[PDB]
Amino acid sequence: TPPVTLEAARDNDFAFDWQAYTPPVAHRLGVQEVEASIETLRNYIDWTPFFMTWSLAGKYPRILEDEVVGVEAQRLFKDANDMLDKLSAEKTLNPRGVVGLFPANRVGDDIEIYRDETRTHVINVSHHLRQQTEKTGFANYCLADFVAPKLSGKADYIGAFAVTGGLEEDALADAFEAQHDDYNKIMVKALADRLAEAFAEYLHERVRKVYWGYAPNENLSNEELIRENYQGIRPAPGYPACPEHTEKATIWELLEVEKHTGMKLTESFAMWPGASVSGWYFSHPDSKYYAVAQIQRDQVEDYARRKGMSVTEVERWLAPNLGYD
Numbered sequence: 001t002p003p004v005t006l007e008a009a010r011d012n013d014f015a016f017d018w019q020a021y022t023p024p025v026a027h028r029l030g031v032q033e034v035e036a037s038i039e040t041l042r043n044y045i046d047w048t049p050f051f052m053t054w055s056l057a058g059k060y061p062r063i064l065e066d067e068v069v070g071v072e073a074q075r076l077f078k079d080a081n082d083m084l085d086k087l088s089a090e091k092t093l094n095p096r097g098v099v100g101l102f103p104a105n106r107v108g109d110d111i112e113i114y115r116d117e118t119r120t121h122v123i124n125v126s127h128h129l130r131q132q133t134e135k136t137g138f139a140n141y142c143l144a145d146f147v148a149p150k151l152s153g154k155a156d157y158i159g160a161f162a163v164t165g166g167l168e169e170d171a172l173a174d175a176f177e178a179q180h181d182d183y184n185k186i187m188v189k190a191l192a193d194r195l196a197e198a199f200a201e202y203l204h205e206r207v208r209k210v211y212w213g214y215a216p217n218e219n220l221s222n223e224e225l226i227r228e229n230y231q232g233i234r235p236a237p238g239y240p241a242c243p244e245h246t247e248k249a250t251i252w253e254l255l256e257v258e259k260h261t262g263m264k265l266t267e268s269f270a271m272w273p274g275a276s277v278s279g280w281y282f283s284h285p286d287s288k289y290y291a292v293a294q295i296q297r298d299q300v301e302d303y304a305r306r307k308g309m310s311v312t313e314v315e316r317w318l319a320p321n322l323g324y325d
């Protein structure tokens with residue numbers, strides 16, 4: 001579909017009656033360091049991507065009873081759970097995280113994050129991009145649209161998180177590598193990945209039910225969590241609704257991630273440990289995932305101004321989303 005101007009895209013933002021809506025108030029404002037044991041997180045693992053890493057097709061648990069691949073899948077699952085048992089008993093891989101909730105309001109394509117409920121001084125801005133092609137029967141979506149506009153006067157909130165399977169991932173993998181034990185190197189990295197993703201799932205549930213507290217009586221099974229049968233989203237910088245990786249620096253500052261977890265950002269804004277997830281929390285019932293996709297020079301230049309970057313810098317960080325040479 002052909003591109004639209006930045007102004008035309010913004011004129012087609014997500015349409016919602018903010019005057020009639022009361023955004024749920026975050027129960028626990030502030031930043032809290034968290035941990036979770038392997039024993040806790042293993043009940044939140046989604047095993048299907050684990051088998052994909054091992055090049056096996058099928059959804060868990062049915063894959064275990066498969067007539068062609070089930071026997072190999074059962075051995076992988078047994079070895080994985082034997083390793084989880086050992087890591088758990090020996091405390092050699094320790095998942096850690098941090099969560100924060102803040103007063104927030106939308107201004108334009110950005111979300112202002114306030115020091116306090118006076119909603120005056122801004123401690124950080126979460127910057128977002130907007131879909132920029134012709135939409136038929138849908139808004140030109142921007143994640144900022146799911147937070148009440150400052151002009152509406154409605155008290156709204158935003159969350160953020162960072163979690164890891166554990167800082168020990170590299171030391172455990174590097175030991176297997178030194179032994180030329182490629183099977184167990186792959187296994188421990190795959191388990192750290194499952195633990196990080198399980199922590200992101202568990203912590204999101206904690207936020208919906210307790211920290212934000214808008215769904216205190218939610219009672220979903222793990223299969224229902226995997227199907228995303230809850231209200232709200234947890235979009236992560238680098239993924240299609242917020243592809244720009246440098247926004248992880250804002251999460252790192254907002255949550256003091258390195259102080260609270262030991263997790264670090266690289267010069268490419270990749271996370272360390274490898275088995276890590278970071279992102280935002282949105283409570284709005286209509287919030288959803290989508291792809292920003294290709295954007296034009298007008299939006300690139302505007303994003304650069306908002307970010308305090310040159311156009312040249314932004315063209316590096318937005319290279320995959322540029323709809324022009």
Ligand SMILES: C[S@@+](CC[C@H](N)C(=O)[O-])C[C@H]1O[C@@H](n2cnc3c(N)ncnc32)[C@H](O)[C@@H]1O
Binds near residue numbers: 049
């Ligand atoms: C990567 S899966 C994680 C849970 C899944 N059961 C698993 O283990 O792989 C889904 C997560 O990716 C992120 N995500 C997926 N699509 C996205 C999009 N279009 N924009 C932003 N984040 C997205 C969100 O953080 C979402 O919770």
